[PDB]
Design an enzyme around this catalytic site. Structure first.
Site, short mmCIF file in Angstrom:
data_model
loop_
_atom_site.label_atom_id
_atom_site.label_comp_id
_atom_site.label_asym_id
_atom_site.label_seq_id
_atom_site.Cartn_x
_atom_site.Cartn_y
_atom_site.Cartn_z
CG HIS A 230 -2.19 -0.94 0.85
ND1 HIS A 230 -2.92 -1.21 2.23
CD2 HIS A 230 -2.32 -1.76 -0.61
CE1 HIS A 230 -3.73 -1.26 2.08
NE2 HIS A 230 -3.01 -2.33 0.74
CD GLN A 231 4.79 3.00 4.09
OE1 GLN A 231 4.28 1.80 5.44
NE2 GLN A 231 4.89 3.76 4.82
#
Length: 187
Positions: free
Chosen positions: A29-30
């Site tokens: 996600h990052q």
RNA sequence: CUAAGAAAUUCACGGCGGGCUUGAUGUCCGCGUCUACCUGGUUCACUGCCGUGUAGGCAG
């Protein structure tokens, strides 16, 4: 998308597969907020619908250059001793297609109490008579755990693999890699 | 096809009067409790936004 890369969780006595897949999902996600775009998909081929288990695999679908750039970035740094890598290969032919949908349930009536009381300026008892406790929804979907950075909360995202189709259509993906109309090849 | 087969106990009532239980007393010497472990086991189902909507999604 034409290219897929498989990452498999290295089976660990120190940590169960649930935490390793959730921290892989969080660092992915990052990585996807750091890279942006709407054309990165995820899939889970070891899905067990009987026990709502995600398994040990993750197949990220994109192009060759996107995956090759995602290999040489620090979103896997400090993790690479806990997972084994694949190679960016072409999806074989033929495969059925399906989606990756996040299904959020309204299992907490306190959020709905706050929403209705905030937007309507009602009373607590008027909201308590408006929504009962039976509005809580039960899900038998697989879930993952993530940690928030600025204002922190650990929350379970529920993933659903939709029905199998024969031909996918155009569509985007979030910063989470979940389906917004786009589909991922299922194999 | 049963030591089977069957059955109405019940009406009424004044237990209370009275009393000094007392004096006396040394518990007591002695004692090694130790050894060794990941409370995390997705189980922190949250917070806010768009939407009239509880219908549906979103962002971390």
């Amino acid at each position: 998308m034409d290219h897929y890369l498989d990452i498999r969780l290295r089976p660990d006595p120190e940590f169960p597969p649930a935490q390793l897949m959730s921290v892989l999902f969080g660092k992915l996600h990052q990585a996807l907020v750091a890279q942006g775009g709407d054309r990165i998909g995820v899939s889970f081929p070891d899905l067990d619908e009987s026990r709502s288990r995600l398994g040990e695999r993750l197949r990220i679908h994109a192009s060759a250059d996107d995956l090759r750039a995602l290999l040489a970035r620090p979103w896997l740094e400090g993790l690479r001793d806990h997972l084994q890598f694949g190679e960016p290969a072409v999806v074989p032919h033929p495969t059925p297609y399906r989606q990756v949908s996040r299904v959020q349930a309204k299992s907490n009536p306190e959020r709905l109490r706050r929403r209705l009381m905030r937007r309507h300026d009602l009373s607590e008892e008027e909201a308590r008579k408006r929504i009962p406790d039976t509005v809580a929804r039960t899900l038998d979907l697989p879930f993952v755990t993530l940690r928030s950075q600025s204002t922190g909360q650990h929350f379970r995202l529920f993933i659903r693999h939709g029905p199998l189709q024969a031909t996918a259509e155009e569509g985007g993906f979030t910063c989470y890699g979940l389906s917004k109309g786009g589909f991922v090849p299922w194999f």
